Enzyme design. Structure first.
Site, PDB file in Angstrom:
ATOM      1  N   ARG A 188      12.875   5.365   4.958  1.00 35.13           N
ATOM      2  CA  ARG A 188      13.535   3.834   5.550  1.00 35.13           C
ATOM      3  C   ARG A 188      15.291   4.643   6.162  1.00 35.13           C
ATOM      4  O   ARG A 188      15.581   6.156   5.363  1.00 35.13           O
ATOM      5  CB  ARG A 188      14.371   2.572   4.257  1.00 35.13           C
ATOM      6  CG  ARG A 188      16.209   2.441   4.608  1.00 35.13           C
ATOM      7  CD  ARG A 188      16.314   1.386   5.149  1.00 35.13           C
ATOM      8  NE  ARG A 188      17.319   0.891   5.048  1.00 35.13           N
ATOM      9  CZ  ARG A 188      18.141   0.447   5.843  1.00 35.13           C
ATOM     10  NH1 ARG A 188      18.226   1.709   6.366  1.00 35.13           N
ATOM     11  NH2 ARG A 188      19.661  -0.216   4.750  1.00 35.13           N
TER      12      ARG A 188
ATOM     13  N   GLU B 136      16.531  -7.631  10.180  1.00 38.74           N
ATOM     14  CA  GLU B 136      14.977  -7.305   9.851  1.00 38.74           C
ATOM     15  C   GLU B 136      14.553  -8.310  10.569  1.00 38.74           C
ATOM     16  O   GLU B 136      14.406  -9.211  10.975  1.00 38.74           O
ATOM     17  CB  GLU B 136      14.841  -7.823   8.602  1.00 38.74           C
ATOM     18  CG  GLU B 136      15.964  -6.371   7.864  1.00 38.74           C
ATOM     19  CD  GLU B 136      15.544  -6.161   5.865  1.00 38.74           C
ATOM     20  OE1 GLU B 136      14.725  -7.041   5.997  1.00 38.74           O
ATOM     21  OE2 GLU B 136      16.054  -5.573   4.923  1.00 38.74           O
TER      22      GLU B 136
ATOM     23  N   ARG C 201      10.810   4.883  -1.102  1.00 32.66           N
ATOM     24  CA  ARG C 201      11.248   4.796   0.320  1.00 32.66           C
ATOM     25  C   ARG C 201      11.920   6.558   0.446  1.00 32.66           C
ATOM     26  O   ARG C 201      12.823   6.494   0.265  1.00 32.66           O
ATOM     27  CB  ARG C 201      11.426   3.615   1.019  1.00 32.66           C
ATOM     28  CG  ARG C 201      10.794   2.616   1.493  1.00 32.66           C
ATOM     29  CD  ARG C 201      11.820   1.201   2.038  1.00 32.66           C
ATOM     30  NE  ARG C 201      12.649   1.168   1.932  1.00 32.66           N
ATOM     31  CZ  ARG C 201      13.521   0.081   2.046  1.00 32.66           C
ATOM     32  NH1 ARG C 201      12.874  -0.269   3.364  1.00 32.66           N
ATOM     33  NH2 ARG C 201      14.996  -0.087   1.492  1.00 32.66           N
TER      34      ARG C 201
END
EC number: 3.1.31.1
Length: 135
Positions: free
Chosen positions: A29, A37, A81
């Site tokens: 990320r 998004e 992430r």
């Protein structure tokens, strides 16, 4: 802060890319950016969402060298992430997106703020130029 080499596996979104890092595949990320998004349970394809995604993808797909840079805070989020700055041939993808007006500077997560001012600098400029989200 240390830059480490990585290999592109796949770009997933404006803010998320999958890399081969220290031999293992892994999702990252982008630190300190809030991006439109293409994912979202709700809102999904938002204004500038596909544009940010296209930009990130082209940037890492065309690079011959990807490097990841972890910051000094927590290095993964609750979804597993990696939280990092990503460089494509020496140029920081995170900064690139903000400078182009395709992301905003996010709230500083867990002590991760080494490049915060550099990015805020880029953001004011994109703002001043009325680029994309700042139109």
């Amino acid at each position: 802060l240390h830059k480490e080499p990585a290999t592109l596996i796949k770009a997933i979104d404006g803010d998320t890319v999958k890399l081969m890092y220290k031999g293992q595949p892994m999702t990252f990320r982008l630190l300190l950016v809030d991006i439109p998004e293409t994912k979202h349970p709700k809102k999904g394809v938002e204004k500038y969402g596909p544009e940010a995604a296209a930009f990130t993808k082209k940037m890492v797909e065309n690079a011959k060298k990807i490097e990841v840079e972890f910051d000094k805070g927590q290095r993964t989020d609750k979804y597993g992430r990696g939280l990092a700055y990503i460089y494509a041939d020496g140029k920081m993808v995170n900064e690139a997106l903000v400078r182009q007006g395709l992301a905003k500077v996010a709230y500083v997560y867990k002590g991760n703020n080494t490049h915060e001012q550099l990015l805020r600098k880029a953001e004011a400029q994109a703002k001043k130029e009325k680029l994309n989200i700042w139109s």
